[PDB]
Each structure stands twice: as structure tokens, then as C-alpha cells.
């Protein structure tokens, strides 16, 4: 069996850098390597074939090279769009792939817009109390997210998830989620999330008063 | 062999 | 579009059977040689089984034989996967990929189908329950409003969410799920949209759970708040 190994394992990477990405086979196959690509939760898609060829609709700036057991993919100017992971994979002897190459991309400061949900009449009926708190589209993925319940700061019933890069502005979004039982909500009325980020002059608070809405 | 064409090969 | 559509993922307990189908579409089904593929983070893709276009000549990976077994029904443009035998490292994503058909002497594999999810678990599997977030006061800013959906309490993953059906992608970002500490996934999806024409557009979230056969249409409504 052929074992294909990639490096580096992760980049970082600029728009309009040339991105390097390099594949070795445990022993000759020849020309029989292909390149996808993945993006999260997605499928992968093929980009090049027999080691240098380009599938119909892929952009020019993705070359493969290469013969034997040293691989090359070149990204000549990298784009936001090309935010993914890659994989080469070796066609001689059945079907096995690289562990793959994921490419990040570095972009300017961008401050998030903060938005706040109270939970829904819906839900309240149901006994359970779920409080969102949602920053969009910022950059770096650092970022400070601290609720706080009648001015006092709450730990150990939130939940934060974040996007992957948008392949568009290569920027992140991300998600505080409160739960409380609808007992223990009904006990307290204000409701905050406190947004700390290096593009913010100073915190960002959303809140509301439990009855308003 | 496995990596032998395995769609139509009319030629 | 050349496409293939992968279904029949959901938990399955070990030892247990399962069975998974691929529904071909803009392409000569009968004509192209089939694969089966599987993703996880840890061990990456794996090659899981080839079947020629007549269904004749079949090939496995070791780490399947005896359990799995490929076949196809070209009449019904559909790839079939039989998995008996179920064990825990069998969880995966299970990808159908055609055949690639570029002259040469060696041949793999070109378009990838969005996958279905294996879960190898004796827990019990559970439909969501879907939440509007509302836009309002609180969630509009430099006049955009946010809004999304909640889907709380499902298990297994994935649960997939569209909005207007399709024809409204722009702005969306649906989260990676949590896992709660009861053991039961929760994610959200929101949009930003004009806080200009909330009175005029519809948002209706379609949430869909293929494990549980669970789909939820929510029109998301403005808060007067």
C-alpha cells in the first residue's frame, strides 16, 4: 500500500501570495496523482489530474507538478475563494490520500457587528430559555464574549461555535448561546453580552430587559 | 486492475 | 450539473446493518464507474470500494471486506453501499464520487457527492426542535437586522439548514453544532438582510434532520421591539 504525505500540514497566507503545497509518495507512481479540494462541510472537488492536468472550470492559477514520489500544487495568486483544505491522492495502486494542507488567509482588522436574541415565547413554553448572542463577520477570530445577568458576569451556561473563513471576505462569525431553565430566567431582568475585540475602540454591550419583546 | 477504466470503453 | 446525492446515514448501533444509497443525476449513470469514500478528522479519507459501469468487477478496501458490499441499479441511476458488521471506527462521512473518465492508463475519481453521516452509537436518535430568532431593536445595526433559526436537541448529526428554499444564500452563516453535556447537538443559522423591508420580505428557515426524517419550515416574523 502507497502512503502519500503532505506538508505543510497548515499555511497562512495573504491575497496575492503564491501558496506551495508539497506531496511525497512512500514509492514511485509515476504521474497518477490528483489534487482536491475541501471546503468545510462540503464536498471535496478535483482540481488537477495525471499530476499537471486541469479539470475543465478550474481557475488557471492552480498548477500541479511533478513525477515519481515529489509532488507540487502552486496557487500563483492566492484568492479568499481558495480558503480550504487539499488533498492529493495517488491512483497507481488503488485509491490513498495525503492527510491534506490547510490553507488560511491572513486579511486586515474588522470589527464585529454585535446582534442579541431573546429567547422565544415558543421555547419559554417549553420550559427552557435560550439566549443568543451573535457577532458578525470579523477578523481576527479572537474575541472576548462575557454575559452578564443583572450586571453580574455569568460562567458555566454559555456554549460559543464559530464559523469557518468566509470565502468571500475571508472574515469569521460567531455564536454565544445562554440556556437557562425557564424558571431561572423568570428570576432576573436584565440580559447582556459583552463583545471585546481589537477592532472595537472599547467593548461592545447588547441587551435587553426580560418582558420587552 | 482495480485502476484499469471502469466506465464505457467503446474503443 | 453532473451531481450525485448520497442518503440513508443515521446512528446505527454496533454490530447492526445499514444500508446507503447514491441517486446519480446529469450524467450517463450507466456508463461511469462508481466509488465509496469516507471522511473523518482524524485517519482523513479513506477509499472504501470501486464498482465497474455494468456492475461487474468490484474492489474493497481491506478494512471492509466481508462486511461491505457494493452494487448499483443503473435502471434507477442509483449506488448502493450494504455495511453489516458495524463497528465504532465505521463512523464517517460516507461520500459516492463518480469515476473520472480522462484517457490514460490508471483512472480515479472527478465529482463528490455532499455526503451522509455514519454514526456508530447506541444512543437513541432524536428529531430538533426549531426556534425563531427574531429580528428586532436589539438585533439591527447601521440599518442591517439579523435573524436566524435555533435547532435544539438532535441526535445524531447532521442537521442541514436552507433559507426561502433555496433561493436565499447570500449573508447566511449556519454554525458548527455544539455537543451538550446531554449528549445532544444544537447549532443556529442567521442572515443579515435589510432593516428596511422587514415588513415586506418573507424568511422562512427549512431545516432539515435526514437521520430522523425531521424537516421544519419556520417563517422567522419581526418583533416589534
Given at each position: 500500500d502507497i502512503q502519500m504525505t503532505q506538508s505543510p500540514s497548515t499555511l497562512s497566507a495573504s491575497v496575492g501570495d503564491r501558496v506551495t503545497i508539497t506531496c511525497r509518495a512512500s514509492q514511485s507512481i509515476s504521474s497518477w496523482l490528483a489534487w482536491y479540494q475541501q471546503k468545510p462541510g462540503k464536498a471535496p472537488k478535483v482540481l488537477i489530474y495525471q499530476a499537471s492536468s486541469l479539470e475543465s472550470?478550474?481557475?488557471?492559477?492552480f498548477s500541479g507538478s511533478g513525477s515519481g514520489t515529489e509532488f507540487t500544487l502552486t496557487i500563483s495568486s492566492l484568492q479568499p475563494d481558495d480558503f480550504a483544505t487539499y488533498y492529493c491522492q495517488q491512483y497507481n495502486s488503488y485509491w490513498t490520500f495525503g492527510q491534506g494542507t490547510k490553507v488560511e488567509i491572513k486579511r486586515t482588522v474588522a470589527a464585529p457587528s454585535v446582534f442579541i436574541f431573546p429567547p422565544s415565547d415558543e421555547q419559554l413554553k417549553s420550559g427552557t430559555a435560550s439566549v443568543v448572542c451573535l457577532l458578525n463577520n470579523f477578523y481576527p477570530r479572537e474575541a472576548k464574549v462575557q454575559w452578564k445577568v443583572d450586571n453580574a458576569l455569568q460562567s458555566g451556561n454559555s456554549q460559543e461555535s464559530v464559523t469557518e473563513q468566509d470565502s468571500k471576505d475571508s472574515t469569521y462569525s460567531l455564536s454565544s448561546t445562554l440556556t437557562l431553565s425557564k424558571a431561572d430566567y423568570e428570576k432576573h431582568k436584565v440580559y447582556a453580552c459583552e463583545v471585546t475585540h481589537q477592532g472595537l475602540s472599547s467593548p461592545v454591550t447588547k441587551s435587553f430587559n426580560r418582558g420587552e419583546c | 486492475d482495480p485502476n484499469a477504466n471502469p466506465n464505457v470503453d467503446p474503443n | 450539473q453532473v451531481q450525485v446525492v448520497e442518503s440513508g446515514g443515521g446512528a446505527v448501533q454496533p454490530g447492526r446493518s445499514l444500508r446507503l444509497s447514491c441517486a446519480a443525476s446529469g450524467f450517463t449513470f450507466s456508463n461511469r464507474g462508481m466509488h465509496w469514500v469516507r471522511q473523518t478528522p482524524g485517519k482523513g479519507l479513506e477509499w472504501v470500494a470501486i464498482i465497474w459501469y455494468d456492475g461487474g468487477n468490484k474492489f474493497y478496501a481491506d478494512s471492509v471486506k466481508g462486511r461491505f458490499t457494493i452494487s448499483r441499479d443503473n435502471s434507477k441511476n442509483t449506488l448502493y453501499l450494504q455495511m453489516n458488521?458495524?463497528?465504532?471506527?465505521?463512523?464517517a462521512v460516507y461520500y459516492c464520487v463518480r469515476a473520472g473518465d480522462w484517457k490514460a492508463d490508471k483512472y480515479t475519481m472527478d465529482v463528490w457527492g455532499q455526503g451522509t453521516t455514519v454514526t456508530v452509537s447506541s444512543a437513541s436518535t432524536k428529531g430538533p426542535s426549531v426556534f425563531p430568532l427574531a429580528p428586532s431593536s436589539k438585533s439591527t445595526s447601521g440599518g442591517t437586522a439579523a435573524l436566524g433559526c435555533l435547532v435544539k436537541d438532535y441526535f445524531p448529526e447532521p442537521v442541514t439548514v436552507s433559507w426561502n428554499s433555496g433561493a436565499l444564500t447570500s449573508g447566511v452563516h449556519t454554525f458548527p453544532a455544539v455537543l451538550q453535556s446531554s449528549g445532544l447537538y444544537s447549532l443556529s443559522s442567521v442572515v443579515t438582510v435589510p432593516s428596511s423591508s422587514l415588513g415586506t420580505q418573507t424568511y422562512i428557515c427549512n431545516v432539515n434532520h435526514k437521520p430522523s426524517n425531521t424537516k421544519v419550515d419556520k417563517k422567522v416574523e419581526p418583533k416589534s421591539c
Open positions: 472550470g478550474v481557475p488557471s492559477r | - | 458488521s458495524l463497528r465504532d471506527e465505521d463512523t
